[PDB]
Design a protein around this ligand. Structure first.
Ligand SMILES: O=c1ccn([C@H]2C[C@H](O)[C@@H](COP(=O)(O)NP(=O)(O)OP(=O)(O)O)O2)c(=O)[nH]1
Ligand SMILES: [Cl-]
Ligand SMILES: [Cl-]
Ligand SMILES: [Cl-]
Ligand SMILES: [Cl-]
Ligand SMILES: [Mg+2]
Ligand SMILES: [Mg+2]
Ligand code: NA
Ligand code: NA
Length: 331
DNA sequence: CGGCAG
DNA sequence: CAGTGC
DNA sequence: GCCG
DNA sequence: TACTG
């Protein structure tokens, strides 16, 4: 369990004894990510968490290699920074990376789109606005480019959650609404608000998006939709943009999912995160012949068995993990 | 050598 | 499906 | 990038 | 893992 971040409190990272190392590695990791080398970036992300949580300053090649998530190549970089204070590869990152970062921060444009735009000769958001072909989503992303990069005070996330909850409970008073993501992990600021909705009777959650969305639109609260499949009635999620009433308010990202009560624990676990916490826990489940989704914990296929998970604590227990409160899942 | 969450 | 984001 |  | 196109 030394080797599984989901087995450890994320508060281990609050005493990073290797900042001069991890601040340099983070630059490389972001360069690989925006260029599309996702697996190399993932290795970097895991090495950075390992270094942030290590109990002391790493001082030797041998000590570094012993750390899970750190191998020979990462160790060599560590000892280059220890000895010289610098990491030479930082001076040799593709010059396209700033522009690729600029472009892939458009919601709906990832690395493939950003690289295409870069190859077409675009270098600024002015170039994108006037010359790029944009999807409906990307055009909304561009319109809200600064908004979507800003994080809101958690107090504002509460007001957003309460807006959604009151609209939902107006037409069914038994609905349960919970803000998840970084809000539930206790962060001071939130990139968006992640609202989970269910009904304890097991069945009244069905067909509420149409009524909820109409209610939120009648108020003027929703200002743009990113993902909202409203035509076939099987809608699990809404992704969009809202703005609280009155002066001094910014457009804020809002994600909503509705789930049947029988799946509450796994959905709450998924939506609280963090993302790397989830991937660790899911990877841990797989090694044990299980599978963890936002819907259920189940055994491996042939159709597997669905394991009983009435609360989040049961998922931890079934994977042999000590329980972590949301604030300790912030990997 | 291949996965790396689902 | 590939690409994208949660 | 790292891991088994 | 659920959307788009
Ligand atoms: O790749 C992902 C992204 C998110 N998730 C889950 C965990 C995450 O906390 C939750 C909400 O996604 P967000 O993008 O909103 N991330 P988070 O709320 O943790 O941080 P913030 O919204 O403040 O950036 O969905 C994943 O499982 N995998
Ligand atoms: Cl009612
Ligand atoms: Cl892990
Ligand atoms: Cl079995
Ligand atoms: Cl629970
Ligand atoms: Mg969030
Ligand atoms: Mg979100
Ligand atoms: Na190691
Ligand atoms: Na993007």
């Amino acid at each position: 369990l030394d080797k599984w971040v989901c087995a450890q409190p994320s508060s281990q990272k609050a005493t990073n004894h290797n900042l001069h190392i991890t601040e340099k590695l983070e630059v490389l990791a972001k360069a690989y990510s925006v260029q599309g080398d996702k697996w190399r970036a993932l290795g970097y992300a895991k090495a950075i968490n390992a270094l942030k949580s290590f109990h002391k300053p790493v001082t030797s090649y041998q000590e570094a290699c012993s750390i899970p998530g750190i191998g020979k190549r990462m160790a060599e970089k560590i000892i280059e920074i220890l000895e010289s204070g610098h990491l030479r590869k930082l001076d040799h990152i593709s010059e396209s990376v700033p522009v690729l970062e600029l472009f892939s921060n458009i919601w709906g444009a990832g690395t493939k789109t950003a690289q295409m735009w870069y190859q077409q000769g675009f270098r600024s958001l002015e170039d994108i606005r006037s010359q790029a072909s944009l999807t409906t989503q990307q055009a909304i992303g561009l319109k809200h480019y600064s908004d979507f990069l800003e994080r809101m005070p958690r107090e504002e996330a509460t007001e957003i959650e309460q807006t959604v909850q009151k609209a939902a409970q107006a037409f069914n008073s038994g609905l349960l609404c919970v803000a998840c993501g970084s809000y539930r992990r206790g962060k001071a600021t939130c990139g968006d608000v992640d609202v989970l909705i269910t009904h304890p009777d097991g069945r009244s959650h069905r067909g509420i998006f149409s009524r909820l969305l109409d209610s939120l639109r009648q108020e003027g609260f929703l200002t743009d939709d990113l993902v909202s499949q409203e035509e076939n009635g099987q809608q699990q999620k809404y992704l969009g943009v809202c703005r609280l009433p009155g002066p001094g308010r910014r457009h804020r990202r809002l994600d909503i999912i509705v789930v049947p009560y029988s799946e509450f624990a796994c959905a709450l676990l998924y939506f609280t995160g963090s993302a790397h916490f989830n991937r660790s826990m899911r990877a841990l489940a797989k090694t044990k012949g299980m599978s963890l989704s936002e819907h259920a914990l189940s055994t491996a296929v042939v159709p597997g068995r669905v394991l009983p998970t009435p609360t989040e604590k049961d998922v931890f227990r079934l994977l042999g993990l000590p329980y972590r409160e949301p604030a300790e899942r912030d990997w």
